[PDB]
Amino acid sequence: ATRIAILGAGPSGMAQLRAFQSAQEKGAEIPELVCFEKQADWGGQWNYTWRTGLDENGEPVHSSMYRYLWSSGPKECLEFADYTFDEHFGKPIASYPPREVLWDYIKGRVEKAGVRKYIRFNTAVRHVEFNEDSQTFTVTVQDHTTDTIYSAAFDYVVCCTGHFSTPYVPEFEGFEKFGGRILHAHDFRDALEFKDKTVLLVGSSYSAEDIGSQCYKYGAKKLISCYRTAPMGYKWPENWDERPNLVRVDTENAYFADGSSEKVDAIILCTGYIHHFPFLNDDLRLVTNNRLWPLNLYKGVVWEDNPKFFYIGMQDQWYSFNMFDAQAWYARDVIMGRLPLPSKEEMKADSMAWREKELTLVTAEEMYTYQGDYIQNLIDMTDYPSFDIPATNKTFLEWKHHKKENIMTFRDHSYRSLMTGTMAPKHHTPWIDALDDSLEAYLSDK
Amino acid sequence: ATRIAILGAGPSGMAQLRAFQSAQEKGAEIPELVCFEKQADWGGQWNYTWRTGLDENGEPVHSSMYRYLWSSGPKECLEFADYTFDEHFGKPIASYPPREVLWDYIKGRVEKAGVRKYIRFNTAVRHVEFNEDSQTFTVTVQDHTTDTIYSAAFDYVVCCTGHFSTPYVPEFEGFEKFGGRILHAHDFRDALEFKDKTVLLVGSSYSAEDIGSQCYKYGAKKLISCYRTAPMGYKWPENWDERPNLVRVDTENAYFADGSSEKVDAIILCTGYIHHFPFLNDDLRLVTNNRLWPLNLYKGVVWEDNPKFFYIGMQDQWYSFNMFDAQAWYARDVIMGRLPLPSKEEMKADSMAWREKELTLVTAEEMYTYQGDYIQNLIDMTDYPSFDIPATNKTFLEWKHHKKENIMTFRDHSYRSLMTGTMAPKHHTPWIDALDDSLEAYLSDK
Ligand SMILES: Cc1cc2nc3c(=O)[nH]c(=O)nc-3n(C[C@H](O)[C@H](O)[C@H](O)COP(=O)(O)OP(=O)(O)OC[C@H]3O[C@@H](n4cnc5c(N)ncnc54)[C@H](O)[C@@H]3O)c2cc1C
Numbered sequence: 001a002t003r004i005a006i007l008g009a010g011p012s013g014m015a016q017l018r019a020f021q022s023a024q025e026k027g028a029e030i031p032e033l034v035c036f037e038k039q040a041d042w043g044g045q046w047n048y049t050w051r052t053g054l055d056e057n058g059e060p061v062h063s064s065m066y067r068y069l070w071s072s073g074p075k076e077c078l079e080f081a082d083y084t085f086d087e088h089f090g091k092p093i094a095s096y097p098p099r100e101v102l103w104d105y106i107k108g109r110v111e112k113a114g115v116r117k118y119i120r121f122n123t124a125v126r127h128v129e130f131n132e133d134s135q136t137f138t139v140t141v142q143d144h145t146t147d148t149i150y151s152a153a154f155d156y157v158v159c160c161t162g163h164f165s166t167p168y169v170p171e172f173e174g175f176e177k178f179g180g181r182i183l184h185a186h187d188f189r190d191a192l193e194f195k196d197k198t199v200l201l202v203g204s205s206y207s208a209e210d211i212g213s214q215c216y217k218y219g220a221k222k223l224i225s226c227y228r229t230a231p232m233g234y235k236w237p238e239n240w241d242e243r244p245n246l247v248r249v250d251t252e253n254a255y256f257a258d259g260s261s262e263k264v265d266a267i268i269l270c271t272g273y274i275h276h277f278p279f280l281n282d283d284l285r286l287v288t289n290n291r292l293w294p295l296n297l298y299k300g301v302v303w304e305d306n307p308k309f310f311y312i313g314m315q316d317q318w319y320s321f322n323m324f325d326a327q328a329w330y331a332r333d334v335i336m337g338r339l340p341l342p343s344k345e346e347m348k349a350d351s352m353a354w355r356e357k358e359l360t361l362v363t364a365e366e367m368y369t370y371q372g373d374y375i376q377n378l379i380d381m382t383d384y385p386s387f388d389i390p391a392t393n394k395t396f397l398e399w400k401h402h403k404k405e406n407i408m409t410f411r412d413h414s415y416r417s418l419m420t421g422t423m424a425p426k427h428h429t430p431w432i433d434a435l436d437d438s439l440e441a442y443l444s445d446k
Numbered sequence: 447a448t449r450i451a452i453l454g455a456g457p458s459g460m461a462q463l464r465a466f467q468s469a470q471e472k473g474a475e476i477p478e479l480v481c482f483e484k485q486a487d488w489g490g491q492w493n494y495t496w497r498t499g500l501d502e503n504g505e506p507v508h509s510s511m512y513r514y515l516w517s518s519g520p521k522e523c524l525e526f527a528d529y530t531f532d533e534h535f536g537k538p539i540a541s542y543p544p545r546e547v548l549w550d551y552i553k554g555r556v557e558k559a560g561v562r563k564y565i566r567f568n569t570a571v572r573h574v575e576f577n578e579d580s581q582t583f584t585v586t587v588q589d590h591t592t593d594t595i596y597s598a599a600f601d602y603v604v605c606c607t608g609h610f611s612t613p614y615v616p617e618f619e620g621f622e623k624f625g626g627r628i629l630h631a632h633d634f635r636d637a638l639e640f641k642d643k644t645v646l647l648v649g650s651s652y653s654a655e656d657i658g659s660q661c662y663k664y665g666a667k668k669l670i671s672c673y674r675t676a677p678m679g680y681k682w683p684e685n686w687d688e689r690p691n692l693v694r695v696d697t698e699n700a701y702f703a704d705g706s707s708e709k710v711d712a713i714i715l716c717t718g719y720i721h722h723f724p725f726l727n728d729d730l731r732l733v734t735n736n737r738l739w740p741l742n743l744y745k746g747v748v749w750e751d752n753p754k755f756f757y758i759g760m761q762d763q764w765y766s767f768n769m770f771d772a773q774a775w776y777a778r779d780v781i782m783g784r785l786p787l788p789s790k791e792e793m794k795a796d797s798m799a800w801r802e803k804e805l806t807l808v809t810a811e812e813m814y815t816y817q818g819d820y821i822q823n824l825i826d827m828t829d830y831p832s833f834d835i836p837a838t839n840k841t842f843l844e845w846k847h848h849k850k851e852n853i854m855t856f857r858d859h860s861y862r863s864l865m866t867g868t869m870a871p872k873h874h875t876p877w878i879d880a881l882d883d884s885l886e887a888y889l890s891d892k
Pocket residue numbers: 007008009010011012013036037038039042043044045046062064065066070071072073078123124125126160161162163164165279312313317318319320321324
């Protein structure tokens with residue numbers, strides 16, 4: 001009568017449900033499942049909302065996604081080994097689908113699987129405690145539909161609440177006096193809000209690349225992006241420059257370590273996120289910066305201090321969807337008794353070996369290869385379909401080259417699926433001109 | 447060795463500490479105090495921040511206040527009976543001080559009292575449980591300076607976390623397609639962000655009045671405000687009209703029940719707040735809409751289901767600072783044994799009588815007079831200095847008339863202090879021209 005709690009119904013929660021459902025379909029007897037989700041529908045980040053800051057129930061808004069967002073890597077690198085792009089759409093499609101298209105895809109797997117019935121939507125997880133005496137977890141949640149706080153007992157808990165939602169938002173001198181809008185990447189919604197405007201983007205990783213690109217694409221007057229350590233280093237459009245870092249601000253201007261300075265309408269902090277778990281105490285709470293190998297997680301997923309608690313997708317992401325699968329399948333097999341955990345000492349020693357290797361990594365290539373090795377090790381222990389990881393590494397490599405070649409057109413290239421073998425078609429419209437981000441617009445043919 | 451927890455160091459928390467400190471100064475022996483505050487300094491709403499949505503630790507941003515905010519009622523109606531405006535500033539000042547000026551004042555009382563030492567700043571209250579077996583509260587908090595979650599036992603808890611922070615944010619058809627900024631009043635920061643723009647304000651209470659006024663004052667091209675029930679009904683500037691309710695929106699336009707419609711750059715939801723206490727379970731959690739008499743609070747402050755738990759300032763606010771005092775002094779005397787509570791049945795019957803009367807109220811005059819009667823009933827039970835409530839009522843009445851006379855110049859009038867008798871000077875600058883909101887600018891003379 002063993003009972004499991006899954007926190008969150010994004011890709012990771014969906015993957016954990018899907019892993020149990022698959023074991024059950026092959027005839028295994030599975031635990032009882034309850035998955036709690038604070039939004040009204042599944043998909044995690046991929047469920048777009050116009051809302052900003054706090055949602056209609058007062059929970060922090062979860063999604064950081066914006067209008068016009070498109071896959072940032074090759075779809076071929078994030079394809080499910082058990083539910084192909086061919087199966088879901090019935091036809092080839094280009095390699096960088098818009099948000100709505102990938103949303104549709106991940107829902108499709110879990111619609112086929114019938115796992116929606118396990119999910120209590122509109123329910124925020126408030127608190128998870130472990131009771132020593134009974135060896136079980138009390139999960140306290142708030143049901144916003146009924147406006148009730150209640151709690152329930154579980155034998156295992158799988159946490160899938162992500163780490164790209166709680167913004168890291170550093171302060172800069174003068175922000176209290178600046179007259180334009182200051183916002184974090186997290187609150188970016190429609191690029192059209194910045195048409196004909198000068199937009200400062202603080203930071204130099206994916207958010208900066210892509211939020212700049214959208215502002216450019218939808219007609220901002222000018223873009224300044226500044227970096228803390230090293231410049232992003234791509235060849236930008238003519239109305240976009242990189243400066244060394246922002247140092248202060250006044251009523252209208254920004255000042256850089258350059259010595260330069262200029263008039264700026266809006267500042268967008270593209271400074272990343274914190275791992276933040278307001279519902280866990282120190283006995284259960286993961287503390288880490290964003291990285292390929294957070295400590296304290298055996299095989300990157302079992303909580304070393306209480307191996308009945310698990311974390312999915314808490315690593316930085318080169319791979320994503322099929323990493324979460326590998327992780328969710330491993331957790332499932334641990335929970336189900338198919339893969340007994342070693343002692344605490346051996347877990348720590350294993351994790352340390354993973355951390356030593358992580359610290360070796362210099363180049364982007366070495367990094368996704370490392371995540372690949374990690375994933376390889378996971379999928380080899382479970383009935384998760386194996387797939388060509390070295391060939392996925394190669395596809396990441398091409399993608400890197402395409403971005404270096406030209407940062408504004410990398411989305412116009414195509415790659416071959418490592419599940420099906422088929423090469424993807426070019427898209428009916430080049431990126432810069434595809435102004436409509438809808439599923440409908442992308443799947444027809446204008 | 448009796449121990450009290452005070453949740454929040456805004457005006458209410460500050461009042462609660464001040465109430466204890468005064469009893470102690472007069473020679474009483476007081477309980478031990480710990481006050482928890484998630485911000486880095488005291489003042490509550492009055493502590494301005496440029497931050498929006500979630501703060502640097504990932505907590506919801508608390509303050510709803512914006513640049514250029516000024517007192518919305520006569521300072522004479524919110525004067526402390528035990529720490530006058532004369533005492534704090536050393537000289538007369540006008541009747542509608544800017545935010546920074548009132549912040550300075552409320553901090554002044556609590557700096558004089560030396561109560562800062564009781565407060566653990568940068569600490570978010572996560573959870574408050576009541577243990578039946580020991581009859582005490584476990585308060586769990588997260589210290590963001592040390593990044594540690596810990597908990598502590600208390601005999602009484604006073605909740606002062608406010609109810610104008612978690613926004614009520616209704617959805618309107620088309621919001622997911624609109625191309626400008628959508629925001630709640632709560633996120634409104636610098637009016638200059640809307641200079642030369644058309645701004646729709648949804649709502650018809652104080653937020654709508656005042657945010658519109660600031661947008662106007664700082665040079666917005668045009669203002670549309672729309673109402674759900676009745677229009678605000680003031681004579682607005684020429685570039686500002688009131689329409690019946692908003693019904694939908696597309697890429698660039700708003701459509702109203704008017705039948706009318708127009709191009710709009712930014713939508714500001716001025717639709718109020720919810721009472722939200724994510725750190726309480728249903729045994730302790732107050733559930734109410736914003737009103738003069740929330741139910742379940744004996745004398746408006748003692749939690750009827752567990753009278754060792756208290757709420758300060760959870761009523762809607764005509765009076766404010768000296769209401770919180772009256773309430774804090776009452777809670778103090780209850781906690782200290784000077785005012786024993788009646789049985790549960792009598793509390794309920796008393797609360798019912800207050801509710802019946804609340805439901806009687808029609809006119810704005812009847813409403814603040816009701817709050818005044820409530821405050822009268824409180825201050826008569828404690829050593830809180832009594833003061834002229836009927837004369838404060840009269841002052842509110844004048845203020846109402848000044849607003850109806852001209853909504854854009856009500857802040858240029860002056861009233862007499864009910865603590866000192868002295869009439870307040872006119873201000874060195876009329877409202878529409880005082881563009882600088884700083885303490886310094888308001889307290890010197892230009
Ligand atoms: C702007 C942005 C763009 C991205 N684009 C890509 C991309 O193009 N390609 C790619 O591979 N990856 C991308 N990512 C990476 C992203 O992390 C993954 O794609 C994927 O969404 C990870 O999903 P997850 O389920 O682990 O967490 P999430 O997707 O964040 O979902 C977590 C779920 O947990 C829920 N939750 C959180 N707290 C609670 C609580 N208290 N109670 C109940 N429920 C809770 C949330 O509501 C949410 O549904 C992007 C990330 C961001 C932020």
